[PDB]
Design a protein around this ligand. Structure first.
Ligand SMILES: O=c1ccn([C@@H]2O[C@H](COP(=O)(O)OP(=O)(O)OP(=O)(O)O)[C@@H](O)[C@H]2O)c(=O)[nH]1
Ligand SMILES: [Mg+2]
Ligand SMILES: [Zn+2]
Ligand SMILES: [Zn+2]
Lengths: 926, 73, 186, 190
RNA sequence: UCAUGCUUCGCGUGGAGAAUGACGUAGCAUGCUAC
RNA sequence: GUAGCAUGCUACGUCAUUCUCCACGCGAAGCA
C-alpha cells in the first residue's frame, strides 16, 4: 500500500496522505449529470471507483488537492490515453498520470488525476439548485473552503434566508470569480477538443471547482479541426448559478479584473449590442443556438425567451442609466418637444418605435394622451433627485418638496364592541380574540413598502427546462379562447377609478373612456402594436384591516396602458373566469356549493391523496422578470390568428415598458422599478396563476430528474424520466407527443387548484415519497433557486387526511359538515377577522350601525359557516352578529318613529336575523 | 377582558391624537404610531399598559388642545 | 284596505252579490252584477297599487333623509365624541398609572415630553404650585405615573436653577411657580 | 292625457252612453252604446299608450344628446388642461444643456435617465439618518453625478428651515428626519 | 393617494318572458228578439 | 236568413299583481 502511494505521487513534489482505506475505493455521494441508455437525470449517485489522496503542503498543513486514482479496464484505458495526449497541451485539463501497478496477480491499469478539488461544478450546482436547510452540508463546506464565509457564519439565525439577512447574497457573490474562471476554462477546453477533432459531451461533474476538465471516457476522435463539443446540459444546468453568484461582476472593471476601477461607460451610449455579442462569444462560445441581442429580431416566443434569458445576465454588466425610454427631440408645429422614441429593455434589448413622425403639425387627443403619459417630458423637466431612503434608481423629482403620506389609525365601533362584550366575548383565555386591526404608519409608509422591491434580483432561468415548462403550462391553459377585441366589446366594471399619473389631475377613468370615441381607442391600440409607450405608474397605498404591519402599496397604472391591455387580454381573461373545473379557479364563487365542487374537483382520482399548499412570501415584489415575461408570452399564445409576430412582440414590449420596468411615481418623485409584477395591471391576478403553475411544473421536473433512476421499480416512470431528460437537454424543438404525456402524468398524480399565489395540490403520496412527483421540499428548492425566496414553514402546509380539506385557501379554512343530510365542505373565516371587521371600520360614518345594516348582513353571510364549527365561540360569533342586526333594526325603527312619526316595520326585514336566509347561501341550488 | 380593552383604547387614543393635528409633527407622530402599533401587537398586558402611559402622556403634553378638567370632571 | 271610495264601492258590490246569491235571481242579473263588481274591484286594485307605490316612494325618501341627517351629525361632532369616548374608556380601564397621570394633569402637573420607558431616560414635569409639589415631590424623589424618579434638576419659572432645599413651606410664595422638575426614571 | 286627437270620439261615446244609461232610455239598445263606448275606450287607450311610449322615447333622446354635450365639454376641458401642462414643462426645459447633450448623441436618441443627470439645474437629496448626511451631503458644496453642487436650503420632514449648523452628531436626535437638501449646480457642472 | 380582477348581499329604473285575475274587440257551436 | 242579447271554445289589445332572466345606476361586504 505504501508503494501504491509512492507511485501515485509520481514525478512531482507531492506530499500526500490517503483518504481511502489502504489501496481501496472510497464511497462518496456526489452529484452526477448522467445520461446512459438506461438512466438519465441530474441526481446524486454513490459511485465508488476512485482512491482519493489528499495533498499536504507547508509542513503538514492539509489543503484541498486530491490525487483521484481509479482502476480501469485496460480497453478504455488505452482510449482515455490517446484522447488525453491530444488534449494535454490545453491549460484547462487536469494533468493525468497513467500507470499499471501490480496489485494482486496482474498489472491492472490506473489513471491518476492530479490536484483536483474535493467537489466538482456539479456538486455546487446540485447544492444550490436542490437546497434543503436540514442537510446543506456540501454547500456549507464549499462556502467555507473557498473563503466565502467563516465556519461560524452558519450559527446565524436563518443565514440562508434571502429576506431575513440579505448578506447571504454577498456570501454567494464571493464564488463569482471562481465560477467565472470555470466558464472561461470551459471555452478553452472546447477549443482544444475542436482543434484536435474530438466529439464529446461536456458535463458538470467532470470539472473540479477550478475549471479543470479530467474525464475523457466518451470522447470519440474525428478528423482534426472538426470536433463538436456538446454543452447543452452543462450551460443549462449552470445558468441559475451565474446570476445567484454574480459571476460576470468582473466584467464591469477595466481589463476584466476586480483589482482595477470600474469602466467609465459613456452616458449617451444606449446600444450595447456589440458588448453583448462580445460577452456571448467570450463565455458561451460553443452554445449552438443563435443569440439575438435585440429580441426584435427573435423568431417566435421560444426564441424570445431563449435570447432574453441571456440579456438578463448581460444587462448586469452595463450601467443602469442606459436602460429606459430612449428620448428624441421632435418638432410639433415648430415647438420642439422631447418625446420617447424607443426603449432599452434589460431583457428585450433596444426597441425602436417604427412610425415616429418628427415635424408634425397638430396634436390629436390620442397624441396628447401619448405625450402626457410617457415620462419623457416629466423627467426631463423635473430636477435631479438622490433619494437615500431607497436603493432603487431615482430619476427626478417632479416638485420642490417631498410628499410624505401617512396612514390613519382606523375608527372604533364602540357600540358593537360593547354589545359583544355583553355577550361574553373578549374574555381572558377565550379562543376568539382580536388579531386584525388598522395599523398606522409614519410619513415614509409608501416609500418603505416600495423599497421592499429590493427583493427582486436578476434571475437567469435554466432555459432548457424553462422552454419545456412553458409548453406544459400552455397545455394547462389550452381549454380557453382568446384574442384581440374591439373597443366596443371591452367591459369596464367601475369607471370611477383613478386614471393613474398624470391623468388623475383632470378626472377619473370615466373622463378618459367617454371623451375619446371607439375610433380613438382602436387607433391607440393599433398604435401600441407597432410602437412602445412608456408610462408612469403611481404607487398607491392600500388602506385595509390586517394582522400584519405591512402598508401594502399597489400600482396605479395609467389609463393609456390599461385601455390597450384590456383590448389585448380581455377575451382570454373573461374566458378564464367563466370556466368551471380548471386548475385556475379564478371566477368560481364559494357560495351555493362552489367550495365543495372545487374541492371535489381537486381531489379527482389521485390514488394515495395527500394535500399540500403554499403562498409566496412577496409574490409581486420577488417574482423574477423571466417568469413574468413568460406569463405574458403564454397569455399571448391565443393571438395566433389576429396578431403577427411583430405585433405580438410590440405588445410584449409595451407590457414590459409599463408594468415590468415602469417609472413609478412614489410621492412626487420618479423612481425606476427593478422588476416583478405591478399589482394593479390589467392581468395581475391571471399572470400570477401562470407563474404559480410554472413553479409547480418546475418542481415536478426537478423531482423526477433528480431521482436515481436505477431504483425506480415502475418501468413506465423510468422511461418517462429518460424521455424527459431527452426532451429537456437533448432536443431543441418541442415534442408535443411527450408534452401531452407529461401533462397527463401531472394531472393523474398531481392535481392543482391555483388562484394567484395561492395553490392547493392533491398529490399521490406514494410517488412523492419515492421521488416521482414534487413534494414540498422540491417546491422550496425551486423557489430558492428560481425566485430568490426561501419559503419558510409558515407559508407551507400539508394534510395527510384529505377528509379535513385544505388547511387554508384564500384565507378560508375548510370543514366537512352535515348540510341538508349530506356531507359537504364549507369554508369558514378566521373569527378574529369577522370580529375585527365589526369593531373597526374605515370611515367615521360606518360607526353608526343603523346607517349601515348591510355591513353586518354581509359579515354574517361570511360568518355563517362557523355555526357548525365544533368550537362554541365560533358559533357564538354568528349568533352575536344576528343579535346585533336585530338590535340595529329595533333602534332604526325607534329613531325613525321618534324623528319622523312614520312607523317603518316591514315583514321582509325579519329574515336578516334568521339563520335560514344564510343557510340558503351554502346549499347547492342557485 | 383587559387586553382587548387596551387595544381599543389605544386605537381611539391615536385617533384623538391624529385629529389634534399631531401629524404636523413628523417626529411626534412617528413616536405615537410606533407606540400604537406596539400596543396592538402586544402579548403581555403589563407592557401594553406601560406603553399606553407614553401615548397618553403625548396627549397630555399639549395642554391647550384637550381640556382634561372638562372631559374628566 | 279601507279609507278609499273605491274600496267602499267594492264592499257595496260584494254585499250586493252576497245578498243576491241567496236570492237566486235571474242569471243575467247575476252575471252583469258580477261584471260591475269586477270593474269596481279592478278600479280599487289600481288605486291600491298607486297607494302602494306612493307609500314605498315616501318611505324611500324618509330613509334617505334620515341617513343624510345622521351622517351629517356623525361627521360633524366627531371631535367631541372621540374625546368623550376616549376618557370613558380610560375611566373603564381603572389602571394605576393612567389614572395617576390623568389626575395629575387635571391640576396642571402635565409632562413636557413623552413619559419614557427606560431607566436611562429624562422626564420633564411642570409643577404648577406648592400643593401639588408636596403631593408628588417628597424628599429628593418624584412619584409620577406610579414610578419613582430621581429629581436631577428643578428649573424655576424664569429658567433659573432652584435647589431642592429652597422649596420650603414659607419659600413657596417667594419662588416663581410653575417649576420644571427634570428627573430620571428609577 | 285628454289632448289626444281621438279623445273627442271617446268623449262623445261616453256622453251617449251616459245619456242612454238613465233618463228613460232603452235597455237592450243601451248595450249597443256600452259596446261603442268599450271600443272607443280601447282605441283611445291604445293611442294613449303609444303616445306615452313616444313621449318617453323623446325624453330618453333628450338625455342622450345632453350627455353627449357634457362629454364633449369635458373632452375640450381636458384637452386644454392637458396641452397646457405640456407647454408649461416645455418652457422649463433649459434648451442650452439639453441641446448640448442631444446634439452629441449618435442619432439623436439618448436614454431618458440622463436628461436630469446631465442637464438638471437643481438637486434634491433626501437623507434618512445622519450617517448618510455625513457621507453624502456634508459641507456646503458636495460632488454628485460628476458635478459640483452648492447647498441652497435644508428642510426637515416638517418642511422647516434647518441651518447647516443644526445638523450635528449630538443634535441629530432633535431633528425631524429625513432632511431634504436642495442643492444648486455650481457653475453649470463644474 | 387608494390599482387590477373575482364573488355576494341590499335597493331602484328599463326590457323580455312565464303564471293567475280583470275588461274590451275579433273568429266558431247552440239558445232568445226586430224583419 | 241579416242584425242584436245569453251560454260554450280560439285569437288580439289594455291594465292588476306574483315570479324568472338580463341591462344599468346606487350603497355595502368578502377575496387574491
Ligand atoms: O390587494 C391586493 C392583494 C394582492 N394582490 C395581488 O396578489 C399578490 C399576493 O397577495 P397576498 O395577499 O397573497 O400577499 P403577498 O403574497 O404579496 O404577501 P404576503 O402577505 O404573503 O407577505 C400580490 O402580490 C398582487 O399580485 C393585489 O393585486 N391586490
Ligand atoms: Mg402571498
Ligand atoms: Zn432570438
Ligand atoms: Zn391579438
Amino acid at each position: 500500500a505504501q508503494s501504491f502511494l509512492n507511485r501515485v505521487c509520481g514525478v512531482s513534489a507531492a506530499r500526500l496522505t490517503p483518504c481511502g482505506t489502504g489501496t481501496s475505493t472510497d464511497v462518496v455521494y456526489r452529484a452526477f449529470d448522467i445520461y446512459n441508455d438506461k438512466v438519465a437525470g441530474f441526481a446524486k449517485f454513490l459511485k465508488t471507483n476512485c482512491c482519493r489522496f489528499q495533498e499536504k503542503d507547508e509542513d503538514d498543513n492539509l489543503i484541498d488537492s486530491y490525487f483521484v486514482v481509479k482502476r480501469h479496464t485496460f480497453s478504455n484505458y488505452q482510449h482515455e490515453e490517446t484522447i488525453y495526449n491530444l488534449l494535454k497541451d490545453c491549460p484547462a485539463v487536469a494533468k493525468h498520470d497513467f500507470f499499471k501497478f501490480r496489485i494482486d496477480g496482474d498489472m491492472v491499469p490506473h489513471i491518476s488525476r492530479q490536484r483536483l478539488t474535493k467537489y466538482t461544478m456539479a456538486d455546487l450546482v446540485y447544492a444550490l439548485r436542490h437546497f434543503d436547510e436540514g442537510n446543506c452540508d456540501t454547500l456549507k463546506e464549499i462556502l467555507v473552503t473557498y473563503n466565502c464565509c467563516d465556519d461560524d457564519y452558519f450559527n446565524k439565525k436563518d443565514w440562508y434566508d434571502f429576506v431575513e439577512n440579505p448578506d447571504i447574497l454577498r456570501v454567494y457573490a464571493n464564488l463569482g470569480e471562481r465560477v467565472r474562471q470555470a466558464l472561461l476554462k470551459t471555452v478553452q477546453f472546447c477549443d482544444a477538443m475542436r482543434n484536435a477533432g474530438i466529439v464529446g459531451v461536456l458535463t458538470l461533474d467532470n470539472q473540479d471547482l477550478n475549471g479543470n476538465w479530467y474525464d475523457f471516457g466518451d470522447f470519440i476522435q474525428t478528423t482534426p479541426g472538426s470536433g463538436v463539443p456538446v454543452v447543452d446540459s452543462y450551460y443549462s444546468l449552470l445558468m441559475p448559478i451565474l446570476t445567484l453568484t454574480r459571476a460576470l461582476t468582473a466584467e464591469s472593471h477595466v481589463d476584466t479584473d476586480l483589482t482595477k476601477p470600474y469602466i467609465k461607460w459613456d452616458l449617451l451610449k444606449y446600444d450595447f449590442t456589440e458588448e453583448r455579442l462580445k460577452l456571448f462569444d467570450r463565455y458561451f462560445k460553443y452554445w449552438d443556438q443563435t443569440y439575438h441581442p435585440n429580441c426584435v429580431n427573435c423568431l417566435d416566443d421560444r426564441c424570445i425567451l431563449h435570447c432574453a434569458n441571456f440579456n438578463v445576465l448581460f444587462s448586469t454588466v452595463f450601467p443602469p442609466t442606459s436602460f429606459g425610454p430612449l428620448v428624441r427631440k421632435i418638432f410639433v408645429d415648430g415647438v420642439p418637444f422631447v418625446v420617447s422614441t424607443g426603449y432599452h429593455f434589460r431583457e428585450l434589448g433596444v426597441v425602436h418605435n417604427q412610425d415616429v413622425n418628427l415635424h408634425s403639425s397638430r396634436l390629436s387627443f390620442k397624441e396628447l394622451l401619448v405625450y402626457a403619459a410617457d415620462p419623457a417630458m416629466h423627467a426631463a423637466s423635473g430636477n435631479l433627485l438622490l433619494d437615500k431612503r431607497t436603493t432603487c434608481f431615482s430619476v427626478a423629482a417632479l416638485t420642490n418638496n417631498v410628499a410624505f403620506q401617512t396612514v390613519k389609525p382606523g375608527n372604533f365601533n364602540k357600540d358593537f364592541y360593547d354589545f359583544a362584550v355583553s355577550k361574553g366575548f373578549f374574555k381572558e383565555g377565550s379562543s376568539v380574540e382580536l388579531k386584525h386591526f388598522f395599523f398606522a404608519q409614519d410619513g415614509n409608509a409608501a416609500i418603505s413598502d416600495y423599497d421592499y422591491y429590493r427583493y427582486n434580483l436578476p434571475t437567469m432561468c435554466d432555459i432548457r427546462q424553462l422552454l419545456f415548462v412553458v409548453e406544459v403550462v400552455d397545455k394547462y391553459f389550452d381549454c380557453y379562447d382568446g384574442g384581440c377585441i374591439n373597443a366596443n366589446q371591452v367591459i369596464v366594471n367601475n369607471l370611477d377609478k383613478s386614471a393613474g399619473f398624470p391623468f388623475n389631475k383632470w378626472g377619473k377613468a370615466r373622463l378618459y373612456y367617454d371623451s375619446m370615441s371607439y375610433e380613438d381607442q382602436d387607433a391607440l391600440f393599433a398604435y401600441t402594436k407597432r410602437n412602445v409607450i412608456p408610462t408612469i405608474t403611481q404607487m398607491n397605498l392600500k388602506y385595509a384591516i390586517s394582522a400584519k404591519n405591512r402598508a401594502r402599496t399597489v400600482a396605479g397604472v395609467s389609463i393609456c396602458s390599461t385601455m390597450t391591455n384590456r383590448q389585448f387580454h380581455q377575451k382570454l381573461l373573461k374566458s378564464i373566469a367563466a370556466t368551471r373545473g380548471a386548475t385556475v379557479v379564478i371566477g368560481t364563487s364559494k357560495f351555493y356549493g362552489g367550495w365543495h365542487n372545487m374541492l371535489k374537483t381537486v381531489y379527482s382520482d389521485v390514488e394515495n391523496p395527500h394535500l399540500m399548499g403554499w403562498d409566496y412570501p412577496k409574490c409581486d415584489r420577488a417574482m423574477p422578470n423571466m417568469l413574468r415575461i413568460m406569463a405574458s408570452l403564454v397569455l399571448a399564445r391565443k393571438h395566433t390568428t389576429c396578431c403577427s409576430l411583430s405585433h405580438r412582440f410590440y405588445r410584449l414590449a409595451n407590457e414590459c415598458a409599463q408594468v415590468l420596468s415602469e417609472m413609478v411615481m412614489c410621492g412626487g418623485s420618479l423612481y425606476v422599478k427593478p422588476g416583478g409584477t405591478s399589482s394593479g395591471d390589467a392581468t395581475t391576478a391571471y399572470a400570477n396563476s401562470v407563474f404559480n403553475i410554472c413553479q409547480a411544473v418546475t418542481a415536478n421536473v426537478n423531482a423526477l430528474l433528480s431521482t436515481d433512476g436505477n431504483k425506480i421499480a415502475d418501468k413506465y416512470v423510468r422511461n418517462l424520466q429518460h424521455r424527459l431528460y431527452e426532451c429537456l437537454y437533448r432536443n431543441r424543438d418541442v415534442d408535443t407527443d411527450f408534452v401531452n404525456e407529461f401533462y397527463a402524468y401531472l394531472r393523474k398524480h398531481f392535481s392543482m387548484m391555483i388562484l394567484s399565489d395561492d395553490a392547493v395540490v392533491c398529490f399521490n403520496s406514494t410517488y412523492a415519497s419515492q421521488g416521482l412527483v414534487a413534494s414540498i421540499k422540491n417546491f422550496k428548492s425551486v423557489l430558492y433557486y428560481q425566485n430568490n425566496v426561501f419559503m419558510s414553514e409558515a407559508k407551507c402546509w400539508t394534510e395527510t387526511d384529505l377528509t379535513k380539506g385544505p388547511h387554508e385557501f384564500c384565507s378560508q379554512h375548510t370543514m366537512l359538515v352535515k348540510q341538508g343530510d349530506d356531507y359537504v365542505y364549507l369554508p369558514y373565516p378566521d373569527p378574529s377577522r369577522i370580529l375585527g371587521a365589526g369593531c373597526f371600520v374605515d370611515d367615521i360614518v360606518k360607526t353608526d350601525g343603523t346607517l349601515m345594516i348591510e355591513r353586518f348582513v354581509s359579515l354574517a353571510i361570511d360568518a355563517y359557516p362557523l355555526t357548525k364549527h365544533p368550537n362554541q365561540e365560533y358559533a357564538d360569533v354568528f349568533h352575536l352578529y344576528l343579535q346585533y342586526i336585530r338590535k340595529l333594526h329595533d333602534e332604526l325603527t325607534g329613531h325613525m318613529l321618534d324623528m319622523y312619526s312614520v312607523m317603518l316595520t316591514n315583514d321582509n326585514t325579519s329574515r336578516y336575523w334568521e339563520p335560514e336566509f344564510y343557510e340558503a347561501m351554502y346549499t347547492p341550488h342557485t | 377582558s383587559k387586553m382587548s380593552d387596551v387595544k381599543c383604547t389605544s386605537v381611539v387614543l391615536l385617533s384623538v391624537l391624529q385629529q389634534l393635528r399631531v401629524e404636523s409633527s413628523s417626529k411626534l407622530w412617528a413616536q405615537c404610531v410606533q407606540l400604537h402599533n406596539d400596543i396592538l401587537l402586544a402579548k403581555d398586558t403589563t407592557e401594553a399598559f406601560e406603553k399606553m402611559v407614553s401615548l397618553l402622556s403625548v396627549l397630555l403634553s399639549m395642554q391647550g388642545a384637550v381640556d382634561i378638567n372638562k372631559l374628566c370632571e | 284596505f279601507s279609507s278609499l271610495p273605491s274600496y267602499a264601492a267594492f264592499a257595496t258590490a260584494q254585499e250586493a252579490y252576497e245578498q243576491a246569491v241567496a236570492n237566486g235571481d235571474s242569471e243575467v242579473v247575476l252575471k252583469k252584477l258580477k261584471k260591475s263588481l269586477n270593474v269596481a274591484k279592478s278600479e280599487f286594485d289600481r288605486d291600491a297599487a298607486m297607494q302602494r307605490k306612493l307609500e314605498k316612494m315616501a318611505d324611500q325618501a324618509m330613509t334617505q333623509m334620515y341617513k343624510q341627517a345622521r351622517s351629517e351629525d356623525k361627521r360633524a361632532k366627531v371631535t367631541s365624541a372621540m374625546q368623550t369616548m376616549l376618557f370613558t374608556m380610560l375611566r373603564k380601564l381603572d389602571n394605576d398609572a393612567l389614572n395617576n397621570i390623568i389626575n395629575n394633569a387635571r391640576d396642571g402637573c402635565v409632562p413636557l415630553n413623552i413619559i419614557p420607558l427606560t431607566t436611562a431616560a429624562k422626564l420633564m414635569v411642570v409643577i404648577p404650585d406648592y400643593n401639588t409639589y408636596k403631593n408628588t415631590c417628597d424628599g429628593t424623589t418624584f412619584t409620577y405615573a406610579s414610578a419613582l424618579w430621581e429629581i436631577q434638576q428643578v428649573v424655576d419659572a424664569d429658567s433659573k436653577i432652584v435647589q431642592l432645599s429652597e422649596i420650603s413651606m414659607d419659600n413657596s410664595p417667594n419662588l416663581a411657580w410653575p417649576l420644571i422638575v427634570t428627573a430620571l426614571r428609577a
